[PDB]
Design an enzyme around this catalytic site. Structure first.
Site, PDB file in Angstrom:
ATOM      1  N   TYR A 186       0.841  -1.184   0.000  1.00  0.00           N
ATOM      2  CA  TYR A 186       0.000   0.000   0.000  1.00  0.00           C
ATOM      3  C   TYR A 186       0.880   1.240   0.000  1.00  0.00           C
ATOM      4  CZ  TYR A 186      -2.863   3.713   2.024  1.00  0.00           C
ATOM      5  OH  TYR A 186      -3.487   4.906   2.282  1.00  0.00           O
ATOM      6  N   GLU A 188      -3.688   7.624  -3.698  1.00  0.00           N
ATOM      7  CA  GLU A 188      -3.591   6.351  -2.998  1.00  0.00           C
ATOM      8  C   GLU A 188      -3.453   5.241  -4.031  1.00  0.00           C
ATOM      9  OE1 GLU A 188      -6.331   5.596   0.087  1.00  0.00           O
ATOM     10  OE2 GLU A 188      -6.497   3.447  -0.315  1.00  0.00           O
TER      11      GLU A 188
END
Lengths: 420, 420, 420, 420
Positions: free
Chosen positions: C125, C213
């Site tokens: 991530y 993101e």
């Protein structure tokens, strides 16, 4: 739901079933068993020191959601170096796994399975299962593997292909191609699927299995479909002629009371109550549980002595109920039949005399020998509390359990005898 | 409220107190006692065969609101001919009176009081009572007779005149005139009131009385004040020197157990519970009741053996508790003192041995002889369940009562013994 | 939680952000946009006619758990032939997606994203986000991609690496290598990760973004890390100088009332109540909501006219509240300040006169011009229900909403005026 | 229970009925009326200055249990000197009596009755009442006087002797002797009882009475039976030809609204609700009350305009409802018939125009003139809220009452009009 009460079918650890598939020639990812981090290191460096998967060999319903005492999530891990493989294995081997099925009495992870990690392209579910509806083995196949299969089966019953098999003529390869092509296999690897299903059916017939579930059977990124999981539920009755499989039974996964009961051919069912029992046959066992729950009680741990058991069997039985301390009042509820009631009367006499059974034994004996059993009970001259009505026996035993737990609170001792 | 637990003061029937006032010279309506309708007829025709009042001689809190088995309202009736007097008396004598105090165990009306009916002009309440606040007898007077006096006393405390009396100098007539004139007597009959009060005080001092309540003292339609009711509460302790009054005690108004207890100088208190007791002293009796009610139990019928009672007294006591069948578990809770504990230990030994007391006797013995009592209990070798803590004893006895009533339901028999 | 009330940050569809990453040179799987099954077929056969993934371009919190009207589960599908790609796309394009965020007013899937399917080896991530704690952009990285990140961040705060950046000196490649090596990248592809992060930061600074993101940034089975998802939350305030990004805003994903409000620079917040409002500033908007909920009411759909808006803006505002039929009573709660209250008084006069606003307008106007506003309200001579206390205004408007909904039930009409 | 709604039968004060019995020759204790303590003194010294009874002349169900503002119990007192007679009368005359029937709006004791006190020997109940079961007057007699008679009548129906009378042949003395001897009179005073009953029946037929209750008729201590109480319920319809009795009606015992309503021949019924009404006929009045209570409302004070009333009558009616402030919403619910609906439409027009009736008038007019009434309502052009369905009218009026009381809370003003 399910059976539970009747028999605990032998479930092997994953690595044993994986080895069984390996020896049968089924296409399978390379896998090995590790008992310590050292051979985990050795196997990890043997497989390439990268892209390795570690699986926990614990027999429980929840394996990816369980928790270890060390504080690790799930039973599966993906390691990329032998060093971190050792690090994670040190947190699995010798550790106790906490899952919702166990709650707090978790099983201990004794070994782990080290396997190569392969990327699946498509996920198929497959299962060879004996069943009564089709009076024999059934090949179930679907293209919804890797996910729980009951939901998709109920919502989409068409997607679950089921094909029966005629046992005397065996399985035919044409049937395997039909199943593969109805699931939706690629037209280039259908032959491999047919060969895998033929080998799996040969294994199914050989080892006296009952249900071989491959979930998910996955095509690799380069063809050559490989099975991921190989759940096998065997047959309890096949112990006499399947020695190799049943000898490898892991006994750490069950309570020592269960092991002792199985050593003497006694079914055991533990519970969360405080009224022990001793019942002949599973049916009357559920009957006794229901009638006790009707009167506000709850059975603690009740048995099943089968048919034709010796007096030593019921002596070991009473030893087994009395071993647990959560029990307060014990009822032997055996009706006659194959199990000659007089040997049970002798067994209660001997077991109460020997182990000093001070708890109220609410006996209820009938069937094929009532004169001998009652005569022996009267001759022995003990507190063997006789009864002869099922509802009356349940009422009496529940009230006696309440009396015992009340007198324990009052710090006083009581003795129970038949009314004059 | 009140005393209840400590002593049951002797209350006579109305006609006995009326006769006592008659012999003392107190102005009083003519009255007679009837045991059968025949002499009721004779007295009714003797008094003029008209304007007659019939009263029931039943010792209860409710007498005008009670009900007979025959179906008559109240205990007082106004008849105007001897024939209807016989008719109503036939529905009183031999009949059982149901009042709220009795509930269902009503007392039986044995006799009736036949009196002349007089029309009152004014209604005064009057009462000579011993009391601690004024350290002696007190003359209470008011002009609110015929009605319950507590309400007007609480709402109007001024209207209730109270005058103390010095015992050594006796009562002085000037005091009686003062009381009469402060109540509000007519100025022509004050002398009669003073004479009546002097005679009542002489009766009060003579018969060792405790409270003489005249309610209502009423002036007639022609002067010559006449007392209507003459309630007299006597002194229990004065039995030794007041033989005439105490011999006339009516025993039908109490349970035969009460009569038997009084025959041996034992206080008895029945209740609505199922845990019998045997307590030394009233104070520890209320203590035992409170501690049993704390643990969810309820005492059934508990006693008070007084001080210095013999072993036969406690044997009769245990006979008395065991006579009632509503009792389940008995605790003898006697602390030492005047009552030598060893005789109680001997009494429990003898009474359990003789009357076959199978109910759990939760003894708790202490005081001035503990070695002898415990030694005798141990030597007798029975199920005499020893305990030595008040809270622990109450817990044990309540739990044993629950165990007994539970085993009775289960139709099984139990025996209780001290933990080894 | 979050902001919600203040501004609705521009969220693009997935394919637009994927294209933006493509033009920036970021390593990315090949992807295309399909508006009809025909070009879906064309692209599927262009990418190899096998191993293709189809994604739904719907702006909602739930995209893999949503349901289509056609009856398909989730917004992502894995197809292996262009024909089944057409079949599944025919069940997505033109269909309405039902997710829990929408509940019943689901957005319509206008286009789909057709991409190549790649097998990830490791899941990282990563996120470049502006933040106040580090007074600027922050590179957040972790090795727990593909899974919700808040849970692992809260349970394991150490695993979430956060590194701030100095804006004036820009980002340095050494920083990117540091982040890659602290996440745990393989030591052979760290350079590619650094280049990808540098390109992503250049895109972040160029397009006036707020949060980029990448979840999960995944290494492929053959190196050359490729981003899977590219969520981008932009800046609302950057509309003036970012024309290309803001012109591509999809307006179908919001109610037409929202589009109309944005056309005039008015914040709009719909709700589930029945008391409309018109509030200056977000803070007093939450204040009005809280005070209405205190009095048992519930606001229906309330606005925010910003600062210095013209009279036409508030006229359009009142048109917008009155457009909804679920509204019953409207309160204009504007305190003074930048927003000159007299123009709001003029706007209420004009809007009530024009659109025939018969619903009770519970005005509460103050600030920097009270004389002009109140004078205009009085001169217009309408049912403009004046109030000047916040709690009193909320009480009045809630009671008026109840009165309106009660009179609608009674099938009677009412008119509201100030007390004389 | 009873009638209540239909007519309020004239009940006189005790002294008026006592005088009426006196002039008829009925045997009666000497009695006089006192308006001040001075003549109370004069009468007390006239009767012998001793043995006097004082009674309060208050028309209420509870007279012996009531309370005065001065703090005296009951309405009856027994005095023995004229001085204390003055003292007690000073606490009755001019004082307000609080009984449970009044609750808090007690009637004021204007005069008192001073009587000689006589001692009763036997207590008989007696009553001459008109009744439909026996199609005329009925002589009821029993020997249970002085006590409430319903209880003994229900429990002992035999004890209540009832004898009918043939009106055309009048009453015969033999019938009076029969009644006296069946009650159980002494055989020496039966003639006096017969004469008293004959005189009472003559009074009953003369003054157009409906029920003459003597309770208790008591024999004195010296014969010559004397009536104690002489309750008389008269006939409302007999006002035209019984001027003397109806002129002596006490108006202080009722609200001034009741007096005003009776001045114009309008029935009035006050209540504890907040929805006024105006109903034609008692039956539809109970119907309106029931239907309002069905919808959660409660009528406040509703009227009955009778038949053929003029427009001034309904104008006074509306004045009367609007006089009370506890009313919120008024419904005129008159169906046609004898009461010509057009005059009610004119009356509502005039009364709303004159008294400024701003409360919502939920009219519902029908019967024998609907065209004229509705035409006048439409011509007058007011807020006269027309309705034509009983259930719809009740729903509308209850909702309007709720709206009015809600807007009063909100401190806002409303105006109600028919939907366009």
């Amino acid at each position: 739901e399910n059976l539970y009460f009747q028999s605990m079918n032998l479930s092997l650890h994953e690595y044993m079933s994986m080895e069984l598939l390996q020896e049968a020639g089924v296409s399978v990812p390379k896998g090995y068993v590790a008992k310590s981090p050292d051979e985990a290191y050795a196997i990890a460096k043997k497989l390439g020191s990268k892209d390795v998967v570690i699986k926990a060999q614990v027999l429980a319903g929840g394996r990816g959601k369980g928790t270890f005492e060390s504080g690790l999530k799930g039973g599966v891990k993906i390691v990329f170096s032998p060093e971190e493989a050792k690090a994670v294995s040190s947190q699995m081997i010798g550790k106790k796994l906490f899952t919702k099925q166990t709650g707090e009495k978790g099983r201990i992870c004794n070994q782990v399975l080290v396997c190569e990690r392969k990327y699946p392209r498509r996920e198929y579910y497959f299962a060879i299962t004996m069943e009564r509806s089709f009076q024999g083995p059934v090949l179930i196949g679907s293209s919804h593997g890797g996910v729980n299969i009951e939901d998709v089966a109920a919502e989409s019953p068409e997607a679950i292909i089921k094909e029966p098999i005629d046992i005397e003529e065996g399985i035919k390869k044409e049937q395997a191609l039909q199943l593969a092509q109805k699931m939706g296999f690629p037209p280039n690897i259908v032959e491999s699927a047919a060969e895998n299903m033929v080998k799996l059916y040969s294994l199914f017939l050989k080892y006296d299995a009952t249900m071989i579930e491959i979930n998910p059977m996955v095509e690799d990124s380069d063809g050559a479909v490989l099975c991921m999981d190989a759940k096998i539920n065997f047959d309890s009755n096949s112990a006499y002629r399947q020695k190799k499989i049943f000898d490898l039974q892991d006994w750490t996964q069950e309570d020592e009371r269960d092991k002792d009961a199985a050593k003497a051919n006694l079914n055991y069912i533990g519970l969360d109550g405080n009224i022990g029992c001793l019942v002949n046959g599973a049916g009357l066992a559920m009957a006794t549980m229901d009638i006790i729950k009707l009167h506000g009680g709850t059975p603690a741990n009740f048995l099943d002595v089968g048919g034709g058991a010796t007096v030593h069997q019921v002596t070991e039985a009473f030893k087994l109920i009395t071993s647990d301390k959560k029990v307060l009042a014990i009822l032997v509820n055996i009706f006659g039949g194959i199990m000659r009631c007089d040997v049970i009367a002798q067994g209660i006499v001997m077991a109460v005399k020997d182990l000093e059974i001070k708890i109220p034994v609410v006996v209820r004996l009938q069937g094929t020998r009532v004169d001998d059993a009652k005569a022996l009970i009267a001759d022995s001259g003990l507190k063997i509390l006789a009864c002869d009505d099922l509802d009356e026996a349940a009422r009496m035993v529940v009230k006696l359990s309440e009396i015992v737990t009340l007198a324990k609170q009052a710090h006083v001792d009581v003795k129970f005898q038949l009314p004059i």
